[PDB]
Each structure stands twice: as C-alpha cells, then as structure tokens.
Ligand binder design. Structure first.
Ligand code: CA
Length: 750
C-alpha cells in the first residue's frame, strides 16, 4: 500500500494541531525541535515523541502551544534521536558527548543526538546543508573530531505545509508511443533567456512560461533533471568557479521536496505551489512532465573514507535508522555500493521501499507529474539486504548485489503493483523509464526489466554513433542498424514488450550534446570557467569531428552528421528522446561530464546563428513529420508485410547481405496504410564514406516517391527538410538516387 504508516508532519482539518510521525526501529528516544527560522536560530520548543507501534513514533502538538512558544509564522522542525550506540544520558545537552558508546555499533546504528535530523517525509526544506551562510560540512559529521558538534542552527529544517489548493491541470492520456521527449535542466532552461522577465529566469515559474516554446518545437513531454531537493544553495558563493558546484542534482537530500533554489517564490509553501502551477502550464499545453528521480543513493553518501568506519555525514536518514535506509557491508560497519557515490539506498528493505513508493505517489498525485525516469535503475532491482547473506533476502545467496526482476519484492516490482502504468493505447497511468544499469555485479540490465518498464537504449546510442564516426576503426554491423531502426526487438521482444519501450537517443546529459558527438574527437573536460573543469565522464564517446581537424571535413559536414543522427532517433520505431538545446546545436565545447557547471556555458541560450536557426527548422519539421506519420510509431513490432529491408540495388536485403560485414548501406520501406498512415515511406542510410546509388523499389502505396529530406551537404540550408506538400518528385520503381556518403534520405509515396 501507499502511505501505510501515515508518516510526516501535518495539520488537522481546522489547523488546531499538527501531528508528527516518524519511523525508527532502533531509536531509544526521539525528540521534536521546533524553530521559527530554518537557519541560525535555536529551537523555540521541544517535545518528546512516543512509540506508536511498528517503529513509528508520534506526538501531536496544538498550534496554540507553538504560537505560545513564539512561532507564529511557518513551522520549521527537526528531530534528535538516541539509540544503542549513543543512549540517552540525563546529563546530555546540545553539543555534549554524554551517553556516547560508539559512532557505529555492531548492528549498524549511527545515532548522534547532537545532529539535528531532517524528516524524510518533510514536504519542503528550508535550506541545504551548505549555503551562503555556512559552507563547512564538518558540523554534520560523526567521528572523533566532529561528533559533539551540534548542527542544530546549521542543519536543514523541514517546513510543515498547509495543503495547497493549486491545480496541476489535466493529465494528458496520450500513448507513450506518440511522445517525443525533451530532457532539460529546469534552471538552465530559462536562466539566461531574455524573453522571460528577469525575476522568473531559471525557475519553475519561468519554465512554465516556455510551454509555448516546446509546443512550437513540437515535443510532447519535458523531462527534468532532478527537482527533488539537491545540494545547490552554495553554488554561487565563490564566483567564476565550478569548484563547489552541483548543477545536475543527482544528490537528493529529501524525496518529497521541490528544490527551493529553482523556485521564484522561496517562501514556505512557495516551491510547492509554484511547481504545481508549472505543471498546470505544461498540462495546459498538452505536454507531459516527467521527473528524473534518484532512489539508488542519497546525498548523505557513505563513510568519508573506506578505511575509517566512524566518519560519515548525518542530517536525515542516517541519524534516524541507518540500518533500515542504507545497505551495509557484512559486519555493518561500512556501506555496500553499486552507485559509486558511497552507499546504496536499501531498496529491498520494506520501510525504505515504502518511502520510494510514498514519495512517487506524492509527486504523481499531488504534484501532477506524468512519469518518472529512474537513475541507475538496476539498484531498484537488488534482492539483497546486506553485504552478507540473510534468509530475509532468500534470492540473494551471495549477499551484496544481485539484480532479480523475478523477485516480486524488489523495488521495481513493488512500483508496478502500487501504480497503474499507462496502457499501450493510452489512457491514464504513469510512464516509467529505467536507465537499466548501475555499477558492478550483474547490474548491467539492458533488456532485463519487467513488462511495464521502458528503458534507455544505450545500444541504440552507441551502435549508431559507431556507424557514423567509427567507419574503418571498428566493425559496424548493418544488422544492428536495422535493429536500431525497427525498435530493437533484440532487446525488447522476448520479455513481451514493444518497440516503444525502447527509449532511443543519440545523446543525453551524460556525455556530449548532439553537435558535440560530431564535432569532438574526444572529451575536453579540463577547460577553465565557464566550460570546466569537470572530472571525467565516459571514455567511450564514439565521437568524431568529421575530418574538421584533418582538413578532410568542414562545418557543413558536422551539420550533415548531426542531421543524420537526429533523423535516426526521430524516424526509428521506439520513443525518441532529445536533449534540450540539440534543436540549435548546443555545444559544451566537448565537455562530456558537465555535472558541476552552473554557468552560462551550461544554460540554454536563445540567440542563434543562421546555421543554428536552420537546424531548428530541420528539427521542427522532422518532429512534425514523425507526429504526422503513424507508420513510424508502431504499437507493436513491424510485421513482415509492413516493413521490407532493401539493399541499395533495390533488391530485398537477404542473408548474404545481412552477414556481409562490409555492407554499410541499408534502406527500408514501410507500408503506410497498414499502420494507418497516409503515405508509405522509404528511408535510406548510406553508412559508407562515399556516394552510393540507391535504386528505388515499388512504393507499397501510391505510385511515386517524393523526397522529404536529404541530409547531405549540398542540401544544407533553411529548407533541407521540406514543408509538407513541397516534397520533390523523385520517381517510381526503378528510379535511382545518388546518396552522398554518411547521410540519410527520407521519401514518402503519393
Ligand atoms: Ca537545494
């Protein structure tokens, strides 16, 4: 169930009382601290909580008592907990060591009463651990040097919210197969956009104002990088330096709270009502709002070092019940990790898992979000509970990490039974997307997720980048191109899934932008502000500048390649995903891991050159085309009568062709009418470095072929992709077409 324990802080109907409920299976004592401000002040009152059974502790406070304590505005709160490793000593006082036994005990408890704790169910956070007033993270650490430090006035406080009456509009019921996703950072979306009033730039409010921009481009779903509270308030303390910045936000501090830094209205309840108003603006434009969520690790991380089990950050989950929330190593002194951040969130533990479900429900229901893309999703399929084996995790015999999509108790299956996934034909429900990998063990699971889950297709990205940029360096399989274009049945069909479950993309936030994969011979992450430096992303970008540096290529060529890559994702069966900015050839000058760049090089710009504006026209018409032709969006795997593979000779691609590893050109035709389309279409990819002549087959429907686009250099301009009705008559069966090397041809029959 959802909200099985009714955790959190909430007012009763008449706002006469607030009830605080919090879980801890090991705590010995839990005490509520109330503050009038989130930072810099001591508490106005404290209330000892009482065991309400099943590990939940509760207390109900009358509002009059709160006002009597001096708190007449918003109620900021936190907890102080005691446990086996640090029991309550009657002489303990803030900043005292009284009662201390150990920083961590044999069972993994890490209680420290000197650390004020943020409720995991807080719906809003006052400020991040590091902010403009304090950038010393040591006040939150355990260990001999810092355990007695009282973090009270520096620690983040939760805000008790009065239910918002803000509408989130009506949720689109469009089938996922008909969507075109646009990934963008909520702050970089409008931060330097002069078409938005300055005060709204880089905020939720500002993003809502760009709904029309997205509608003209033609995308149907915006996917935001993490919006749940992340460490970002100290980003601008030191100017012209990415040193202490966290831009992307893959360090969640709280799972129910919209990040305050991204809101225009920063008052208590402001980020919340503003995020709701923002999705209303999108929902009004008929656009879905997806959220990138990260439940594989927490911002608290693990131990500071792998040799000292005593020092770790404590401000939320860890202080309340470390053994419940994190996956500990055998012996419980350290953390088990498959994320590389320091510690796995214990996704297999019921209470930890309930938090994932409960926060997802909050965002989907109260916040109006239409779907979620799960970062390092394989950690949510872990059937282990600890570094060592435990009978409670029967399916994880070796302990540690073990992905098991058949275990009904892993987080990815729990989600499926608590929520309704949108049907293939549309209707209400959620759209769930997984990045099917993590770090180590059997975590790489592309094609391993259950029905109900779509996945980020890394093989689509890589194989096509290779086909365009690695000719001669590595083997390119013409059969893989085919798989890519047809919805990767090789990955999705055996599980009973469909082509639209393949999220096809050439580029995402991780790695290079579209322009960059065709303009960079490698990553360049060591530039100075505002382009770097950034500590390395992948070593395998499969990028190439099209001969630019060698003198065998030029700018048109990089644009020809970018046109070809975008066409691959927009023409292929599956659900296309483009990175915001790719519509104007956004570049990061080859930085392929810009996660710490909260700068102008990273935000989007809307002042474009002719060549950039020309690309936007290409992108806009290509997205419009996909949306106008159902034959490109099959709900099920193309049947044999619906799609025919052709060799350049106009002859059907046979086994001799498929098994010949020196064949780089491929073409196909789809029977438009059989898929409910008005035209049949023919796509040709010349993966060869030189000109290839394609002999057109007989149109499945209609009598003649008309050219829609040719990505080749000669066709570079404002009209490389024609407007509907201006297709150039090429010819019928037998007509030939000379296709330049490394490019794509699009044709419709009439
Ligand atoms: Ca923040």
């Amino acid at each position: 169930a959802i909200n099985s324990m009714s955790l959190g802080a909430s007012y009763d109907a008449q706002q006469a009382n607030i009830t605080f409920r919090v879980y801890s299976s090991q705590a010995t004592r839990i005490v509520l601290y109330l503050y009038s401000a989130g930072y810099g002040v001591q508490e106005s009152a404290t209330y000892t909580l009482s065991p309400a059974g099943s590990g939940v502790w509760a207390v109900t406070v009358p509002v009059s008592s709160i006002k009597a304590a001096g708190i007449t505005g918003a109620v900021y709160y936190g907890y102080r907990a005691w446990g086996p490793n640090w029991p309550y000593a009657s002489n303990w006082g803030k900043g005292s060591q009284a009662g201390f036994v150990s920083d961590v005990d044999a069972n993994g408890d890490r209680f420290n009463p000197n650390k004020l704790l943020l409720d995991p169910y807080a719906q809003e956070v006052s400020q991040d651990p590091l902010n403009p007033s304090n950038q010393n993270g040591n006040v939150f650490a355990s260990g001999a040097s810092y355990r007695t430090t009282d973090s009270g006035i520096y620690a983040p406080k939760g805000v008790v919210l009065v239910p918002s009456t803000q509408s989130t509009g009506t949720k689109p019921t469009r089938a996922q197969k008909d969507d075109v996703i646009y990934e963008v950072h909520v702050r970089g979306f409008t931060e330097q956009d002069t078409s938005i009033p300055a005060q709204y730039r880089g905020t939720y409010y500002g993003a809502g104002l760009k709904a029309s921009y997205l509608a003209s481009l033609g995308v149907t779903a915006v996917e935001f990088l993490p919006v749940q509270e992340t460490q970002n308030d100290a980003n601008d303390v030191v100017p012209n330096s990415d040193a202490n910045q966290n831009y992307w936000g893959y360090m969640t501090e709280n799972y129910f709270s919209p990040d305050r830094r991204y809101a225009y209205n920063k008052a208590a309840g402001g980020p919340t009502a503003e995020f709701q108003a923002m999705v209303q603006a999108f929902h009004n434009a008929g656009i879905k709002v997806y959220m990138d969520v990260v439940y594989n690790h927490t911002a608290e991380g693990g131990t500071w070092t792998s040799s000292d089990p005593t020092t770790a950050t404590i401000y939320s989950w860890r202080g309340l019940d470390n053994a419940t929330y994190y996956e500990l190593t055998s012996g419980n002194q350290y953390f088990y990790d498959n994320t590389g951040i320091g510690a796995n969130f214990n996704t297999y533990n019921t209470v930890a898992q309930n938090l994932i479900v409960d926060s997802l429900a909050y965002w989907a229901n109260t916040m109006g979000v239409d779907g979620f893309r799960f970062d390092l999703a394989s950690v949510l399929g872990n059937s282990c509970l600890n570094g060592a084996y435990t009978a409670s995790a029967p399916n994880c015999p070796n302990g540690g990490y073990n992905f098991d999509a058949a275990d009904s108790n892993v987080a990815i299956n729990r989600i499926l039974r608590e929520f309704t996934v949108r049907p293939a034909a549309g209707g209400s429900g959620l759209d769930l997307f997984a990045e099917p990998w993590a770090i180590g063990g059997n975590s790489y699971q592309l094609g391993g997720f259950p029905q109900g889950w779509s996945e980020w297709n890394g093989l689509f990205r890589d194989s096509l980048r290779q086909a365009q940029n690695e000719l001669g360096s590595m083997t390119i399989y013409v059969t893989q191109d085919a798989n890519d274009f047809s919805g990767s049945s090789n990955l999705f069909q055996s599980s009973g899934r469909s082509p639209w479950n393949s999220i096809n993309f050439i580029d995402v936030h991780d790695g290079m932008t579209l322009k960059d994969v065709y303009s960079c011979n490698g990553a360049n992450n060591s530039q100075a502000w505002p382009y770097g430096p950034s500590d390395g992303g992948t070593s395998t970008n499969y990028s190439w500048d099209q001969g630019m540096s060698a003198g065998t290529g030029a700018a048109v060529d990089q644009r020809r390649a970018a046109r070809t890559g975008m066409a691959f994702e927009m023409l292929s069966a599956g659900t296309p995903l483009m990175q915001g900015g790719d519509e104007y050839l956004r570049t990061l000058q080859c930085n392929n891991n810009a996660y710490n760049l909260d700068s102008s090089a990273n935000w989007l710009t809307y002042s474009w050159t002719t060549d950039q504006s020309n690309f936007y026209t290409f992108a806009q018409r290509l997205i419009a085309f996909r949306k106008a032709h159902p034959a490109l969006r099959p709900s099920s795997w193309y049947s044999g009568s619906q799609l025919t593979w052709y060799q350049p000779s106009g002859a059907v691609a046979d086994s001799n062709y498929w098994n010949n590893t020196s064949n780089y050109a491929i073409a196909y035709a789809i029977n438009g009418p059989s898929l409910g389309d008005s035209n049949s279409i023919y796509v040709a990819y010349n993966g060869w470095s030189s000109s290839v002549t394609f002999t057109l087959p007989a149109p499945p429907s209609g009598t003649q072929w008309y050219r829609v686009t040719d990505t080749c250099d000669w066709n570079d301009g404002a009209s490389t992709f024609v407007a509907p009705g201006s297709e150039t008559l090429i010819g019928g069966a037998g007509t030939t077409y000379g296709q330049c090397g490394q490019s794509l041809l699009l044709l419709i029959s009439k």
